[PDB]
Design an enzyme around this catalytic site. Structure first.
Site, PDB file in Angstrom:
ATOM      1  N   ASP A 287      29.750  22.000   4.541  1.00  0.00           N
ATOM      2  CA  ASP A 287      31.113  22.008   4.032  1.00  0.00           C
ATOM      3  C   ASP A 287      31.430  23.411   3.462  1.00  0.00           C
ATOM      4  O   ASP A 287      30.554  24.281   3.390  1.00  0.00           O
ATOM      5  CB  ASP A 287      31.285  20.863   3.033  1.00  0.00           C
ATOM      6  CG  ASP A 287      32.748  20.341   2.952  1.00  0.00           C
ATOM      7  OD1 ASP A 287      33.698  21.034   3.369  1.00  0.00           O
ATOM      8  OD2 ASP A 287      32.930  19.244   2.416  1.00  0.00           O
ATOM      9  N   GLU A 492      41.416  15.862  -1.717  1.00  0.00           N
ATOM     10  CA  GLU A 492      40.196  16.186  -2.470  1.00  0.00           C
ATOM     11  C   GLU A 492      40.425  15.955  -3.950  1.00  0.00           C
ATOM     12  O   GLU A 492      41.012  14.961  -4.324  1.00  0.00           O
ATOM     13  CB  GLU A 492      39.627  17.599  -2.103  1.00  0.00           C
ATOM     14  CG  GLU A 492      39.078  17.603  -0.670  1.00  0.00           C
ATOM     15  CD  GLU A 492      38.736  18.967  -0.047  1.00  0.00           C
ATOM     16  OE1 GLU A 492      37.610  19.474  -0.240  1.00  0.00           O
ATOM     17  OE2 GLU A 492      39.560  19.491   0.741  1.00  0.00           O
TER      18      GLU A 492
HETATM   19  O1  LIG Z   1      41.905  28.874  -4.334  1.00  0.00           O
HETATM   20  N1  LIG Z   1      40.719  28.836  -4.040  1.00  0.00           N
HETATM   21  O2  LIG Z   1      39.951  29.734  -4.363  1.00  0.00           O
HETATM   22  C1  LIG Z   1      40.252  27.748  -3.314  1.00  0.00           C
HETATM   23  C2  LIG Z   1      38.963  27.247  -3.568  1.00  0.00           C
HETATM   24  C3  LIG Z   1      38.529  26.161  -2.836  1.00  0.00           C
HETATM   25  C4  LIG Z   1      39.403  25.625  -1.885  1.00  0.00           C
HETATM   26  O3  LIG Z   1      38.972  24.571  -1.154  1.00  0.00           O
HETATM   27  C5  LIG Z   1      39.064  24.717   0.264  1.00  0.00           C
HETATM   28  O4  LIG Z   1      40.441  24.858   0.629  1.00  0.00           O
HETATM   29  C6  LIG Z   1      40.952  24.478   1.912  1.00  0.00           C
HETATM   30  C7  LIG Z   1      41.944  25.638   2.241  1.00  0.00           C
HETATM   31  O5  LIG Z   1      42.690  26.114   1.086  1.00  0.00           O
HETATM   32  C8  LIG Z   1      39.844  24.104   2.945  1.00  0.00           C
HETATM   33  O6  LIG Z   1      40.420  23.534   4.142  1.00  0.00           O
HETATM   34  C9  LIG Z   1      38.522  23.359   2.436  1.00  0.00           C
HETATM   35  S1  LIG Z   1      38.093  21.712   2.833  1.00  0.00           S
HETATM   36  C10 LIG Z   1      36.524  21.050   2.689  1.00  0.00           C
HETATM   37  O7  LIG Z   1      36.746  21.931   3.777  1.00  0.00           O
HETATM   38  C11 LIG Z   1      36.542  21.591   5.181  1.00  0.00           C
HETATM   39  C12 LIG Z   1      37.255  22.556   6.135  1.00  0.00           C
HETATM   40  O8  LIG Z   1      38.677  22.677   5.935  1.00  0.00           O
HETATM   41  C13 LIG Z   1      36.850  20.123   5.486  1.00  0.00           C
HETATM   42  O9  LIG Z   1      36.499  19.793   6.825  1.00  0.00           O
HETATM   43  C14 LIG Z   1      36.066  19.243   4.539  1.00  0.00           C
HETATM   44  O10 LIG Z   1      36.266  17.834   4.845  1.00  0.00           O
HETATM   45  C15 LIG Z   1      36.448  19.564   3.082  1.00  0.00           C
HETATM   46  O11 LIG Z   1      35.601  18.924   2.146  1.00  0.00           O
HETATM   47  C16 LIG Z   1      38.192  23.634   0.947  1.00  0.00           C
HETATM   48  O12 LIG Z   1      37.969  22.423   0.207  1.00  0.00           O
HETATM   49  C17 LIG Z   1      40.695  26.136  -1.628  1.00  0.00           C
HETATM   50  C18 LIG Z   1      41.126  27.203  -2.360  1.00  0.00           C
END
Ligand SMILES: O=[N+]([O-])c1ccc(O[C@@H]2O[C@@H](CO)[C@H](O)[C@H](S[C@@H]3O[C@H](CO)[C@@H](O)[C@H](O)[C@H]3O)[C@@H]2O)cc1
Ligand SMILES: *[C@@H]1O[C@H](CO)[C@@H](O)[C@H](O)[C@H]1NC(C)=O
Ligand SMILES: *[C@@H]1O[C@H](CO)[C@@H](O)[C@H](O)[C@H]1NC(C)=O
Length: 603
Positions: A287, A492
């Site tokens: 992840d 989430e």
């Molecule tokens: O602002 N920050 O710094 C920040 C920090 C963490 C973040 O968290 C992240 O932000 C999203 C984009 O902003 C992402 O898509 C992922 S998701 C996690 O990611 C995978 C791929 O997308 C999925 O398949 C999974 O099922 C899921 O558990 C993450 O949790 C966002 C922004």
């Protein structure tokens, strides 16, 4: 000529091509395969110079707002061109969260979220949704979908409960039919645990998140799952075995811990169980910053994060930004003997196996003739049938003497549509839509509940919309009935929620509308929420979950074109104090039990 290179020969067996390519690769080329970066940090030089194995779009990560299928294809091909230009010409695999359609993409059909699909109890329906999702993901040039989430959500206070088909694992095991819809059906002779993708009109899938993501203490996201081996294997594990049977290509590991051990550092489950017992031969992906979060605080010792995650058995790391450090660190561990080359070779073997198996080396580039698959009406019609099938009728008359409100008549002098979720597409789709956290308003192409009503009623029926009308307005309006829609906002961890009460106005709008005219209340939510007050005011009440872009699936049932058939895939609690509370428990005291749903017959 004598420029023949076995791994580039499409007639050769996958394991031959994998071994031929692997024997040629440098360490840098190998570690590159194991590295997945965000499109936001990628450039042609970065991809080529670091021999990068894979890209993704996290939620909301798009080339621009409103991009066409073609703009997606061109971005993906631009990255692929850089990758194909390396010494060995190994194509990258591009991943995305298409978890209810190709949901990051404007104009993509948006299907009901998993909880709703559980309500349908229809695995063949889910399969068809995988088929159409694969088409709309390939329409954007993407080859890999981070789905299905086969979490068994055991506490609806988890902000990801809507990504789980059910609290009942038998339902989740049945809904792994998504996999062969995304990837294509596996051949007759197939060995369980082998990866499979049929070809360029299908995508690689990903069973996630291994394992017990849905059993956390108080449904706290990413947290600890306190259960013994037997409960792990009887509840959280079985659908992984169904996924192996259907040839799922990849498995993503959970942020979650299992009895205090980080899943991303857990060699026994990842290597001992998943690879060596289930015989999984696809690749295992972290992840997002999952290895960083092995440590407390996260990121405080990235060297260990790497060592531990790779020795635990992970094959590809969703870095996704600090690729330079990842590569440097892993390279040093290998050069120092801290990680053996056999581990590197296994990771790369699996990654290459998936790529060859799926036909990536034969079709690394997007097909422009597929761009017209995005938003296709036939997919919308499927989504509309899914939405309608997902709906659970919880009440249909205030007393057992009352006339049943639903189905409503399509002809009436004047009707009222009301509520914060009556005419708000983002709210009806929920999270993982256009943006990571979803959003509010007209975010993409679709049909709101209001628009669906207008589309369905007789030409002589006057439809009045008011988002939050007062009581006097309703009582004064001469309405035959009202449809009022309210619920949760998209989310989430932002959706972790200890109190599970819908926001206001919501209850107040229902009470105001239903107090003036007979009303059907449509509840939009990712999970059960405190509902007794909504029930007490409402003549009829429908749990519509997060039905996605095709709001006509709601009105198809409201107006009796189809009968209500859905059934709760989760337990509806009387009180959050009761939680966690699942079918089978000690003091199982549900407001509505798993399996519950009222029916109607079509008119
Ligand atoms: O602002 N920050 O710094 C920040 C920090 C963490 C973040 O968290 C992240 O932000 C999203 C984009 O902003 C992402 O898509 C992922 S998701 C996690 O990611 C995978 C791929 O997308 C999925 O398949 C999974 O099922 C899921 O558990 C993450 O949790 C966002 C922004
Ligand atoms: C669970 O959350 C608690 C409270 O925030 C935190 O202190 C703890 O470290 C978390 N545990 C795990 C295993 O993630
Ligand atoms: C729907 O049909 C079944 C059997 O035909 C019946 O038991 C149920 O009560 C019916 N509802 C209506 C409105 O006819």
């Amino acid at each position: 000529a004598a420029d023949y290179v076995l791994y580039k020969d499409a007639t050769k067996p996958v394991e031959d091509r994998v071994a031929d390519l692997l024997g040629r690769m440098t360490l840098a080329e190998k570690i590159g395969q194991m590295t997945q970066i965000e499109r936001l940090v990628a450039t042609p030089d970065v991809l080529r110079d670091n021999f990068i194995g894979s890209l993704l779009s996290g939620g909301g990560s798009v080339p621009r707002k409103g991009a066409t299928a073609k703009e997606w294809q061109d971005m993906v091909d631009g990255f692929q061109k850089a990758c194909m230009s390396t010494r060995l010409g190994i194509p990258m695999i591009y991943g995305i969260d298409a978890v209810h359609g190709q949901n990051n993409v404007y104009g993509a059909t948006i299907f009901p979220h998993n909880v709703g699909l559980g309500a349908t109890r229809d695995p063949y329906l889910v399969k068809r949704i995988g088929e159409a999702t694969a088409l709309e993901v390939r329409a954007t040039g993407i080859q890999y979908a981070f789905a299905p989430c086969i979490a068994v959500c055991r506490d609806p206070r988890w902000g990801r409960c809507y990504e789980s088909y059910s609290e009942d694992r038998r339902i989740v095991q049945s809904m792994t039919e998504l996999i062969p819809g995304l990837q294509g059906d596996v051949p007759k002779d197939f060995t369980s645990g082998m990866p499979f993708v049929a070809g360029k009109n299908k995508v690689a899938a990903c069973a996630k998140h291994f394992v017990g993501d849905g059993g956390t203490v108080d449904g706290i996201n990413e947290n600890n799952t306190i259960i013994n081996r037997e409960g792990l294997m009887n509840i959280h594990m079985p659908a992984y075995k169904n996924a192996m049977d259907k040839g799922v290509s990849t498995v993503m590991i959970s942020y979650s811990s299992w009895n205090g051990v980080k899943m991303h550092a857990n060699q026994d489950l990842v290597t001992g169980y998943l690879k060596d017992t289930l015989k999984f031969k696809g690749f295992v992906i972290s992840d997002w910053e999952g290895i960083d979060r092995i440590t407390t605080p996260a990121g405080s010792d990235y060297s260990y994060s790497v060592k531990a995650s790779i020795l635990a058995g992970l094959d590809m790391i969703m870095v996704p930004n600090k690729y330079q450090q990842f590569i440097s660190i892993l390279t040093g561990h290998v050069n120092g003997g801290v990680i053996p080359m056999s581990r590197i070779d296994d990771a790369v073997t699996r990654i290459l196996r998936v790529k060859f198996t799926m036909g990536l080396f034969e079709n690394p580039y997007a097909d422009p003739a597929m761009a017209e698959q995005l938003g296709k009406q036939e997919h919308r019609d499927l989504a509309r049938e899914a939405a309608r099938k997902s709906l659970v009728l919880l009440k249909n008359g205030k007393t057992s003497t009352d006339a049943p409100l639903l189905p409503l008549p399509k002809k009436a002098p004047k009707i009222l549509v009301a509520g914060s979720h009556a005419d708000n597409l983002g709210y009806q789709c929920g999270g993982w839509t256009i943006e990571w956290q979803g959003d509010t308003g007209r975010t993409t192409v679709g049909t709101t509940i209001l628009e669906a009503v207008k589309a369905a009623v007789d030409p002589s029926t006057v439809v009045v919309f008011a988002e939050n009308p007062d009581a006097e307005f309703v009582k004064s309006g001469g309405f035959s009935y009202a449809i009022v829609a309210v619920g949760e906002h998209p989310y989430e961890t932002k959706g972790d929620n200890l109190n599970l009460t819908i926001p206001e106005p919501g209850l107040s709008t229902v009470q105001a509308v239903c107090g003036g005219v007979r009303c059907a209340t449509v509840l939009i939510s990712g999970r059960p929420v405190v509902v007794q007050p909504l029930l007490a005011a409402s003549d009829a009440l429908v749990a519509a979950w997060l039905p996605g872009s095709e709001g006509q699936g709601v009105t198809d049932a409201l107006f009796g074109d189809f009968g209500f058939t859905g059934r709760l895939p989760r337990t509806w609690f009387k009180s959050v104090d009761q939680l966690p509370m699942n079918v089978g428990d000690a003091h199982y005291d549900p407001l509505f039990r798993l399996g519950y749903g009222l029916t109607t017959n079509a008119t």
